């Protein structure tokens, strides 16, 4: 696993990427590591924001699948052509595999200017692959074609003219013990589509939010390396902000700050970290009635942004935001921990990162067990659409 350490890079808030090669001879591309999606897709046509792209005509091993795919989202979209080719991760397992590749021909608000990545590695399950679940995801192909164990783990690490560079590790096929401290605690994967989990309790500075736990998972809770923020459902978001405004009340920040639309600054190094509370998310444990907590510091949720106008100040963005599609445990959550995607055992492990950002008074934590009696089911059941229902599953 030594050779996979530090195999991720990126710019702050622009996702983490790993180097990959596609085709024969190998074409090198930087690929966004996304546990929030399930397609392996690469820019395969010139784009203002792409320095380079996949040129299928240049690969002797490319096989066109003679099928197009259309992938829209709320904030962006891409369309492309399906095919297969030889794919490798140079700073990954010492194997080359034949995987599906979506060759992105048209896109809108998908690629980011200066992010230095040209494709996406969707690490989630076939259920959410486009156009449907018969398009085998990359990781499934990797495990099927090689002896690579059905597990990967992510260690996402910290951050004038440019955004800060971030570093990290994607350990394919195992757990690297030098990447964490203390115990690895596991939460069950609720269902294999997104990496769906269940949050049972939420505390802000040791104070319970006092909400029906179903609210925490309305309409789902997922672990997403492709999202920067800790995203919370509307009602949960409102309660966390009121709680966070309460603890930091000595500072009257504008409304733009709480919406993540404005930065707040202090004199260089005078950040009053102590007025901001810790946030603990209790995750369902492997044992009924048991849970563990992951505690995040304000250093995780107040993202540094270098003001070119005021370089003599430390400025921050609020990186907790409102969601209408459930909780998203993005980079804000992941950066404090070593996160184990144990597909083989259908569970996600969390441990304190060997690289987490902390002060001399508090530390990001992973602690357990915690118990509850006669505990209700915190999981939400998404209303079944007739379209979804009509699908056959052969
Ligand atoms: C690194 C980040 C800053 O940027 C990107 C992150 C991702 C990964 N992943 C983010 C969440 C996703 C789906 C997408 C696959 C789902 N959401 C509801 S979304 O907001 O619609 N969204 C999204 C967000 C932006 C563009 C877009 F096409 C979709 C992909 C492309 C990015 O540029
Ligand atoms: Zn049928
Ligand atoms: Zn099917």
Tab-separated table of C-alpha atoms and ligand atoms in Angstrom:
chain	number	residue	atom	x	y	z
A	1	UNK	CA	0.000	0.000	0.000
A	2	UNK	CA	3.144	2.235	0.413
A	3	UNK	CA	3.118	3.031	-3.363
A	4	UNK	CA	-0.558	4.188	-3.193
A	5	UNK	CA	0.044	6.700	-0.354
A	6	UNK	CA	-0.319	10.280	-1.680
A	7	UNK	CA	-1.851	9.052	-4.956
A	8	UNK	CA	-4.560	11.771	-4.755
A	9	UNK	CA	-4.197	15.503	-5.438
A	10	UNK	CA	-6.466	18.400	-6.242
A	11	UNK	CA	-7.411	22.003	-5.526
A	12	UNK	CA	-9.442	22.923	-2.411
A	13	UNK	CA	-13.177	22.515	-3.094
A	14	UNK	CA	-12.497	21.060	-6.580
A	15	UNK	CA	-12.448	17.401	-5.588
A	16	UNK	CA	-9.659	14.864	-5.268
A	17	UNK	CA	-8.220	13.102	-8.320
A	18	UNK	CA	-6.070	10.039	-9.062
A	19	UNK	CA	-3.885	9.502	-12.144
A	20	UNK	CA	-5.211	6.817	-14.495
A	21	UNK	CA	-4.302	5.442	-17.885
A	22	UNK	CA	-6.720	4.360	-20.553
A	23	UNK	CA	-6.071	2.481	-23.800
A	24	UNK	CA	-3.094	0.946	-25.654
A	25	UNK	CA	-0.688	2.794	-25.641
A	26	UNK	CA	-1.725	4.302	-22.230
A	27	UNK	CA	-3.241	7.812	-22.293
A	28	UNK	CA	-2.744	9.552	-18.917
A	29	UNK	CA	-5.661	11.378	-17.377
A	30	UNK	CA	-6.495	12.770	-13.942
A	31	UNK	CA	-9.729	11.327	-12.645
A	32	UNK	CA	-12.073	12.647	-9.905
A	33	UNK	CA	-12.565	10.004	-7.128
A	34	UNK	CA	-16.307	9.878	-6.653
A	35	UNK	CA	-18.028	7.600	-4.153
A	36	UNK	CA	-21.254	9.486	-5.097
A	37	UNK	CA	-21.626	7.968	-8.589
A	38	UNK	CA	-21.040	4.732	-10.531
A	39	UNK	CA	-19.801	5.567	-14.069
A	40	UNK	CA	-16.239	5.763	-15.259
A	41	UNK	CA	-16.472	8.655	-17.753
A	42	UNK	CA	-13.722	10.760	-19.387
A	43	UNK	CA	-13.593	13.945	-21.492
A	44	UNK	CA	-13.215	12.625	-25.077
A	45	UNK	CA	-13.644	15.852	-27.090
A	46	UNK	CA	-12.037	19.317	-26.773
A	47	UNK	CA	-13.474	21.415	-23.952
A	48	UNK	CA	-12.439	24.932	-22.875
A	49	UNK	CA	-11.625	23.566	-19.370
A	50	UNK	CA	-9.842	20.364	-20.547
A	51	UNK	CA	-6.052	20.471	-21.262
A	52	UNK	CA	-6.308	16.922	-22.724
A	53	UNK	CA	-8.883	14.233	-23.376
A	54	UNK	CA	-9.352	10.557	-24.253
A	55	UNK	CA	-8.687	9.897	-27.924
A	56	UNK	CA	-10.333	6.501	-28.693
A	57	UNK	CA	-8.903	6.465	-32.239
A	58	UNK	CA	-5.402	6.266	-30.646
A	59	UNK	CA	-6.142	3.035	-28.648
A	60	UNK	CA	-5.584	-0.349	-30.339
A	61	UNK	CA	-7.563	-1.959	-27.447
A	62	UNK	CA	-10.685	0.248	-27.614
A	63	UNK	CA	-13.987	-1.494	-28.425
A	64	UNK	CA	-16.983	0.773	-29.222
A	65	UNK	CA	-20.215	-0.451	-27.539
A	66	UNK	CA	-22.266	1.449	-30.187
A	67	UNK	CA	-24.449	3.016	-27.445
A	68	UNK	CA	-24.710	6.540	-26.116
A	69	UNK	CA	-25.388	7.557	-22.493
A	70	UNK	CA	-27.069	10.775	-21.153
A	71	UNK	CA	-26.277	11.761	-17.581
A	72	UNK	CA	-28.058	14.823	-16.169
A	73	UNK	CA	-27.801	16.188	-12.610
A	74	UNK	CA	-29.187	19.258	-10.846
A	75	UNK	CA	-25.927	21.234	-11.212
A	76	UNK	CA	-24.565	19.840	-14.481
A	77	UNK	CA	-24.574	17.135	-17.123
A	78	UNK	CA	-22.617	15.096	-19.578
A	79	UNK	CA	-23.408	12.914	-22.583
A	80	UNK	CA	-21.110	10.413	-24.252
A	81	UNK	CA	-20.385	7.190	-26.052
A	82	UNK	CA	-19.996	3.830	-24.340
A	83	UNK	CA	-17.167	1.431	-25.042
A	84	UNK	CA	-14.525	-0.648	-23.313
A	85	UNK	CA	-10.760	-0.291	-22.995
A	86	UNK	CA	-7.761	-1.275	-20.897
A	87	UNK	CA	-7.686	0.887	-17.770
A	88	UNK	CA	-4.994	1.234	-15.137
A	89	UNK	CA	-4.158	3.242	-11.959
A	90	UNK	CA	-0.282	3.796	-12.120
A	91	UNK	CA	-0.136	4.583	-8.369
A	92	UNK	CA	-2.617	1.817	-7.617
A	93	UNK	CA	-2.776	-1.979	-7.925
A	94	UNK	CA	-0.151	-3.465	-10.323
A	95	UNK	CA	-2.923	-4.626	-12.747
A	96	UNK	CA	-4.624	-3.492	-15.954
A	97	UNK	CA	-8.297	-4.281	-16.389
A	98	UNK	CA	-10.882	-4.016	-19.236
A	99	UNK	CA	-13.546	-1.597	-18.049
A	100	UNK	CA	-16.510	0.289	-19.404
A	101	UNK	CA	-15.580	3.848	-20.385
A	102	UNK	CA	-18.089	6.564	-21.205
A	103	UNK	CA	-16.408	8.913	-23.714
A	104	UNK	CA	-17.756	12.376	-22.833
A	105	UNK	CA	-18.578	14.245	-26.042
A	106	UNK	CA	-20.851	17.047	-24.722
A	107	UNK	CA	-21.050	18.475	-21.176
A	108	UNK	CA	-22.484	21.378	-19.272
A	109	UNK	CA	-21.106	22.554	-15.888
A	110	UNK	CA	-19.409	19.203	-15.383
A	111	UNK	CA	-15.665	20.011	-15.766
A	112	UNK	CA	-14.223	22.771	-13.502
A	113	UNK	CA	-11.675	25.384	-14.683
A	114	UNK	CA	-8.234	24.679	-13.181
A	115	UNK	CA	-9.327	21.543	-11.222
A	116	UNK	CA	-6.692	19.548	-13.257
A	117	UNK	CA	-9.032	16.535	-13.701
A	118	UNK	CA	-10.523	15.241	-17.006
A	119	UNK	CA	-12.821	12.429	-15.968
A	120	UNK	CA	-14.658	10.767	-13.116
A	121	UNK	CA	-14.201	7.451	-11.270
A	122	UNK	CA	-17.675	6.538	-10.005
A	123	UNK	CA	-16.948	4.107	-7.109
A	124	UNK	CA	-20.535	3.449	-6.044
A	125	UNK	CA	-22.702	0.469	-7.061
A	126	UNK	CA	-24.250	-0.720	-10.319
A	127	UNK	CA	-27.744	0.262	-9.106
A	128	UNK	CA	-27.030	3.908	-9.852
A	129	UNK	CA	-24.890	3.363	-13.001
A	130	UNK	CA	-26.137	5.072	-16.203
A	131	UNK	CA	-27.943	4.162	-18.432
A	132	UNK	CA	-28.854	1.216	-16.150
A	133	UNK	CA	-27.444	-1.395	-13.677
A	134	UNK	CA	-26.093	-3.715	-16.495
A	135	UNK	CA	-23.224	-1.208	-17.086
A	136	UNK	CA	-20.697	-2.747	-14.782
A	137	UNK	CA	-18.810	-0.131	-12.708
A	138	UNK	CA	-15.008	0.117	-12.680
A	139	UNK	CA	-14.472	-1.350	-9.207
A	140	UNK	CA	-16.735	-4.336	-9.959
A	141	UNK	CA	-14.561	-5.048	-13.121
A	142	UNK	CA	-11.368	-4.612	-11.091
A	143	UNK	CA	-12.483	-7.162	-8.474
A	144	UNK	CA	-13.897	-9.628	-11.035
A	145	UNK	CA	-10.878	-9.620	-13.375
A	146	UNK	CA	-8.039	-9.609	-10.791
A	147	UNK	CA	-7.373	-10.882	-7.234
A	148	UNK	CA	-7.922	-7.316	-5.827
A	149	UNK	CA	-9.920	-7.563	-2.550
A	150	UNK	CA	-13.407	-5.996	-2.582
A	151	UNK	CA	-12.489	-2.961	-0.499
A	152	UNK	CA	-10.897	0.432	-0.918
A	153	UNK	CA	-10.107	3.135	1.638
A	154	UNK	CA	-9.716	6.915	1.373
A	155	UNK	CA	-7.564	9.253	3.414
A	156	UNK	CA	-8.485	12.791	2.263
A	157	UNK	CA	-6.025	15.318	3.706
A	158	UNK	CA	-5.900	19.082	4.422
A	159	UNK	CA	-5.547	22.113	2.098
A	160	UNK	CA	-2.878	34.118	-3.580
A	161	UNK	CA	-3.476	33.504	-7.317
A	162	UNK	CA	-4.606	29.883	-6.996
A	163	UNK	CA	-6.621	27.605	-4.686
A	164	UNK	CA	-4.688	25.523	-2.133
A	165	UNK	CA	-3.462	22.123	-3.252
A	166	UNK	CA	-4.877	19.087	-1.323
A	167	UNK	CA	-3.317	15.666	-0.935
A	168	UNK	CA	-4.677	12.255	-0.117
A	169	UNK	CA	-4.552	8.489	-0.536
A	170	UNK	CA	-6.838	5.938	-2.191
A	171	UNK	CA	-5.782	2.528	-1.015
A	172	UNK	CA	-7.236	-0.032	-3.449
A	173	UNK	CA	-7.783	-3.573	-2.047
A	174	UNK	CA	-7.017	-2.934	1.596
A	175	UNK	CA	-6.394	-0.947	4.773
A	176	UNK	CA	-3.150	0.925	5.496
A	177	UNK	CA	-2.669	1.065	9.252
A	178	UNK	CA	-0.161	3.966	9.121
A	179	UNK	CA	-3.078	6.138	7.869
A	180	UNK	CA	-5.113	6.110	11.072
A	181	UNK	CA	-4.880	6.120	14.869
A	182	UNK	CA	-7.200	4.490	17.388
A	183	UNK	CA	-10.059	2.159	16.450
A	184	UNK	CA	-11.743	1.653	13.085
A	185	UNK	CA	-15.524	1.695	13.770
A	186	UNK	CA	-17.968	0.332	11.174
A	187	UNK	CA	-21.404	1.479	10.085
A	188	UNK	CA	-23.536	-0.843	7.874
A	189	UNK	CA	-24.055	0.006	4.200
A	190	UNK	CA	-27.884	0.287	4.284
A	191	UNK	CA	-28.337	-0.616	0.612
A	192	UNK	CA	-25.823	-0.994	-2.204
A	193	UNK	CA	-26.579	1.930	-4.558
A	194	UNK	CA	-24.914	5.022	-3.113
A	195	UNK	CA	-22.759	4.309	-0.029
A	196	UNK	CA	-25.899	4.750	2.072
A	197	UNK	CA	-25.592	4.889	5.871
A	198	UNK	CA	-27.903	5.725	8.840
A	199	UNK	CA	-27.282	8.598	11.295
A	200	UNK	CA	-29.009	7.864	14.642
A	201	UNK	CA	-28.145	11.028	16.648
A	202	UNK	CA	-26.657	14.498	16.008
A	203	UNK	CA	-25.012	16.674	18.686
A	204	UNK	CA	-23.635	20.240	18.404
A	205	UNK	CA	-21.165	20.885	21.322
A	206	UNK	CA	-22.489	17.876	23.251
A	207	UNK	CA	-26.065	19.131	22.898
A	208	UNK	CA	-28.536	16.775	21.231
A	209	UNK	CA	-30.432	18.318	18.262
A	210	UNK	CA	-33.556	16.515	19.591
A	211	UNK	CA	-34.973	15.485	16.264
A	212	UNK	CA	-36.710	12.284	15.140
A	213	UNK	CA	-33.670	10.419	13.742
A	214	UNK	CA	-35.568	9.789	10.423
A	215	UNK	CA	-35.049	13.577	9.740
A	216	UNK	CA	-31.239	12.933	9.722
A	217	UNK	CA	-31.708	10.404	6.874
A	218	UNK	CA	-34.454	12.214	4.880
A	219	UNK	CA	-34.430	11.064	2.102
A	220	UNK	CA	-31.081	9.282	2.489
A	221	UNK	CA	-27.595	9.726	4.031
A	222	UNK	CA	-24.602	8.974	1.795
A	223	UNK	CA	-20.777	9.100	2.103
A	224	UNK	CA	-19.658	11.143	-0.983
A	225	UNK	CA	-16.012	11.959	-1.749
A	226	UNK	CA	-17.224	13.916	-4.814
A	227	UNK	CA	-19.035	16.567	-2.697
A	228	UNK	CA	-17.067	19.229	-0.788
A	229	UNK	CA	-19.587	20.119	1.918
A	230	UNK	CA	-21.358	18.472	4.756
A	231	UNK	CA	-24.840	18.737	3.226
A	232	UNK	CA	-27.819	18.425	5.583
A	233	UNK	CA	-31.605	18.060	4.933
A	234	UNK	CA	-33.542	21.410	5.217
A	235	UNK	CA	-34.866	20.922	8.858
A	236	UNK	CA	-31.568	19.444	10.137
A	237	UNK	CA	-29.612	22.283	8.407
A	238	UNK	CA	-31.888	24.924	10.070
A	239	UNK	CA	-31.355	23.306	13.525
A	240	UNK	CA	-27.532	22.985	13.095
A	241	UNK	CA	-27.155	26.678	11.977
A	242	UNK	CA	-29.341	27.953	14.889
A	243	UNK	CA	-27.146	25.808	17.237
A	244	UNK	CA	-23.871	26.979	15.585
A	245	UNK	CA	-25.062	30.657	15.584
A	246	UNK	CA	-25.876	30.155	19.333
A	247	UNK	CA	-22.306	28.990	20.304
A	248	UNK	CA	-20.541	31.668	18.174
A	249	UNK	CA	-22.994	34.508	19.157
A	250	UNK	CA	-20.099	36.886	20.116
A	251	UNK	CA	-19.600	37.237	16.318
A	252	UNK	CA	-22.407	38.677	14.213
A	253	UNK	CA	-21.647	37.314	10.766
A	254	UNK	CA	-23.925	38.313	7.854
A	255	UNK	CA	-26.575	36.023	6.319
A	256	UNK	CA	-24.345	35.475	3.259
A	257	UNK	CA	-21.852	33.690	5.508
A	258	UNK	CA	-24.403	31.055	6.739
A	259	UNK	CA	-25.493	30.453	3.123
A	260	UNK	CA	-21.791	29.846	2.169
A	261	UNK	CA	-22.010	32.883	-0.164
A	262	UNK	CA	-19.578	35.113	1.790
A	263	UNK	CA	-16.271	34.798	3.618
A	264	UNK	CA	-15.593	35.879	7.240
A	265	UNK	CA	-12.123	37.045	8.244
A	266	UNK	CA	-9.953	37.530	11.325
A	267	UNK	CA	-6.478	39.037	11.694
A	268	UNK	CA	-3.840	36.504	10.515
A	269	UNK	CA	-3.822	33.665	13.079
A	270	UNK	CA	-6.367	35.165	15.501
A	271	UNK	CA	-9.223	32.820	14.429
A	272	UNK	CA	-11.366	32.276	17.560
A	273	UNK	CA	-11.746	28.495	16.897
A	274	UNK	CA	-13.014	27.984	20.491
A	275	UNK	CA	-16.313	29.839	19.817
A	276	UNK	CA	-17.248	27.333	17.149
A	277	UNK	CA	-18.733	24.054	18.390
A	278	UNK	CA	-17.772	20.451	17.509
A	279	UNK	CA	-20.392	18.457	15.596
A	280	UNK	CA	-20.882	14.766	16.367
A	281	UNK	CA	-22.786	12.435	14.031
A	282	UNK	CA	-23.667	9.128	15.667
A	283	UNK	CA	-23.728	6.353	13.046
A	284	UNK	CA	-25.636	3.060	13.391
A	285	UNK	CA	-23.176	0.319	14.599
A	286	UNK	CA	-22.805	-3.273	13.462
A	287	UNK	CA	-24.695	-4.401	16.611
A	288	UNK	CA	-28.435	-3.616	17.131
A	289	UNK	CA	-28.938	-0.684	19.513
A	290	UNK	CA	-25.229	0.248	19.226
A	291	UNK	CA	-23.769	3.310	17.578
A	292	UNK	CA	-20.450	5.186	17.369
A	293	UNK	CA	-19.787	8.894	16.887
A	294	UNK	CA	-17.609	10.792	14.466
A	295	UNK	CA	-16.724	14.252	15.853
A	296	UNK	CA	-15.767	17.027	13.455
A	297	UNK	CA	-14.021	20.263	14.403
A	298	UNK	CA	-14.751	23.811	13.061
A	299	UNK	CA	-11.418	23.466	11.226
A	300	UNK	CA	-13.272	20.932	9.019
A	301	UNK	CA	-16.483	22.952	8.488
A	302	UNK	CA	-14.909	26.447	8.129
A	303	UNK	CA	-12.963	26.084	4.850
A	304	UNK	CA	-9.930	28.454	4.399
A	305	UNK	CA	-10.033	30.730	1.291
A	306	UNK	CA	-7.088	33.097	0.567
A	307	UNK	CA	-8.362	36.668	0.018
A	308	UNK	CA	-6.079	38.336	-2.593
A	309	UNK	CA	-7.446	41.783	-1.512
A	310	UNK	CA	-6.842	41.037	2.228
A	311	UNK	CA	-3.811	38.701	2.352
A	312	UNK	CA	-3.149	39.775	5.991
A	313	UNK	CA	-6.331	37.947	7.170
A	314	UNK	CA	-7.482	34.346	7.611
A	315	UNK	CA	-10.841	34.079	5.729
A	316	UNK	CA	-13.270	31.170	5.811
A	317	UNK	CA	-16.285	29.771	4.001
A	318	UNK	CA	-19.070	27.926	5.890
A	319	UNK	CA	-19.017	24.449	4.370
A	320	UNK	CA	-22.328	23.087	5.777
A	321	UNK	CA	-25.186	23.565	3.345
A	322	UNK	CA	-28.896	22.828	2.800
A	323	UNK	CA	-30.000	19.700	0.899
A	324	UNK	CA	-33.334	18.548	-0.579
A	325	UNK	CA	-31.843	15.078	-1.338
A	326	UNK	CA	-30.694	13.949	2.096
A	327	UNK	CA	-27.445	14.152	4.086
A	328	UNK	CA	-24.208	14.210	2.168
A	329	UNK	CA	-21.055	13.415	4.087
A	330	UNK	CA	-18.628	15.147	1.762
A	331	UNK	CA	-14.972	16.176	2.098
A	332	UNK	CA	-15.885	18.240	5.229
A	333	UNK	CA	-16.632	14.966	6.964
A	334	UNK	CA	-14.026	12.750	5.220
A	335	UNK	CA	-10.963	14.981	5.803
A	336	UNK	CA	-11.049	14.231	9.560
A	337	UNK	CA	-10.981	10.462	8.995
A	338	UNK	CA	-9.580	7.365	7.352
A	339	UNK	CA	-12.653	5.995	5.564
A	340	UNK	CA	-12.876	2.297	4.745
A	341	UNK	CA	-15.326	1.284	1.962
A	342	UNK	CA	-15.617	-2.391	2.925
A	343	UNK	CA	-17.755	-3.603	0.045
A	344	UNK	CA	-16.961	-7.262	0.885
A	345	UNK	CA	-18.584	-6.804	4.338
A	346	UNK	CA	-21.190	-4.194	3.260
A	347	UNK	CA	-19.947	-1.649	5.854
A	348	UNK	CA	-18.088	1.717	5.950
A	349	UNK	CA	-15.304	2.084	8.562
A	350	UNK	CA	-14.222	5.368	10.185
A	351	UNK	CA	-11.049	5.984	12.178
A	352	UNK	CA	-9.170	9.168	13.231
A	353	UNK	CA	-6.901	10.224	10.313
A	354	UNK	CA	-3.119	10.337	10.781
A	355	UNK	CA	-3.459	13.633	8.708
A	356	UNK	CA	-6.505	15.406	10.334
A	357	UNK	CA	-6.269	19.239	11.122
A	358	UNK	CA	-6.473	20.078	14.883
A	359	UNK	CA	-5.666	22.573	17.687
A	360	UNK	CA	-4.155	22.041	21.153
A	361	UNK	CA	-7.610	21.872	22.835
A	362	UNK	CA	-9.814	19.573	20.616
A	363	UNK	CA	-9.309	16.745	18.053
A	364	UNK	CA	-11.603	15.140	15.474
A	365	UNK	CA	-12.730	11.845	17.057
A	366	UNK	CA	-14.251	8.421	16.325
A	367	UNK	CA	-15.692	6.922	19.577
A	368	UNK	CA	-17.870	4.087	20.746
A	369	UNK	CA	-19.954	2.266	21.592
A	370	UNK	CA	-23.108	4.319	22.432
A	371	UNK	CA	-26.435	2.603	23.291
A	372	UNK	CA	-30.224	3.263	22.973
A	373	UNK	CA	-33.153	1.119	24.140
A	374	UNK	CA	-36.385	0.415	22.137
A	375	UNK	CA	-34.764	2.502	19.357
A	376	UNK	CA	-36.975	3.269	16.306
A	377	UNK	CA	-35.760	2.761	12.675
A	378	UNK	CA	-33.942	5.957	11.541
A	379	UNK	CA	-33.979	4.930	7.872
A	380	UNK	CA	-36.382	6.625	5.420
A	381	UNK	CA	-38.207	4.690	2.676
A	382	UNK	CA	-38.216	6.623	-0.573
A	383	UNK	CA	-41.731	6.836	-2.151
A	384	UNK	CA	-41.797	4.178	-4.924
A	385	UNK	CA	-42.421	5.665	-8.347
A	386	UNK	CA	-44.327	3.583	-10.917
A	387	UNK	CA	-41.305	3.967	-13.319
A	388	UNK	CA	-38.932	2.471	-10.672
A	389	UNK	CA	-41.455	-0.283	-9.818
A	390	UNK	CA	-42.030	-1.246	-13.514
A	391	UNK	CA	-38.308	-2.134	-13.870
A	392	UNK	CA	-37.468	-5.850	-14.124
A	393	UNK	CA	-34.280	-7.005	-12.421
A	394	UNK	CA	-32.735	-9.891	-14.423
B	1	LIG	C1	-15.709	18.367	-7.179
B	1	LIG	C2	-17.074	19.027	-7.236
B	1	LIG	C3	-16.970	20.430	-6.670
B	1	LIG	O1	-17.515	19.206	-8.593
B	1	LIG	C4	-18.005	18.063	-9.206
B	1	LIG	C5	-18.358	16.926	-8.532
B	1	LIG	C6	-18.845	15.835	-9.230
B	1	LIG	C7	-19.268	14.614	-8.464
B	1	LIG	N1	-20.737	14.641	-8.083
B	1	LIG	C8	-21.091	15.789	-7.213
B	1	LIG	C9	-22.540	15.668	-6.782
B	1	LIG	C10	-23.501	15.621	-7.942
B	1	LIG	C11	-23.126	14.510	-8.882
B	1	LIG	C12	-21.661	14.541	-9.266
B	1	LIG	C13	-21.367	13.234	-9.968
B	1	LIG	C14	-24.892	15.293	-7.403
B	1	LIG	N2	-25.545	16.565	-7.039
B	1	LIG	C15	-26.988	16.447	-6.731
B	1	LIG	S1	-25.067	17.798	-8.084
B	1	LIG	O2	-24.652	18.975	-7.348
B	1	LIG	O3	-26.013	17.911	-9.164
B	1	LIG	N3	-23.652	16.967	-8.568
B	1	LIG	C16	-22.905	17.598	-9.613
B	1	LIG	C17	-22.116	18.679	-9.280
B	1	LIG	C18	-21.448	19.393	-10.254
B	1	LIG	C19	-21.561	19.016	-11.573
B	1	LIG	C20	-22.374	17.952	-11.908
B	1	LIG	F1	-22.486	17.601	-13.205
B	1	LIG	C21	-23.078	17.257	-10.942
B	1	LIG	C22	-18.956	15.905	-10.602
B	1	LIG	C23	-18.641	17.060	-11.286
B	1	LIG	C24	-18.172	18.142	-10.575
B	1	LIG	O4	-17.801	19.324	-11.201
B	2	LIG	ZN1	-38.662	-9.319	-17.304
B	3	LIG	ZN1	-31.650	-5.504	-14.939
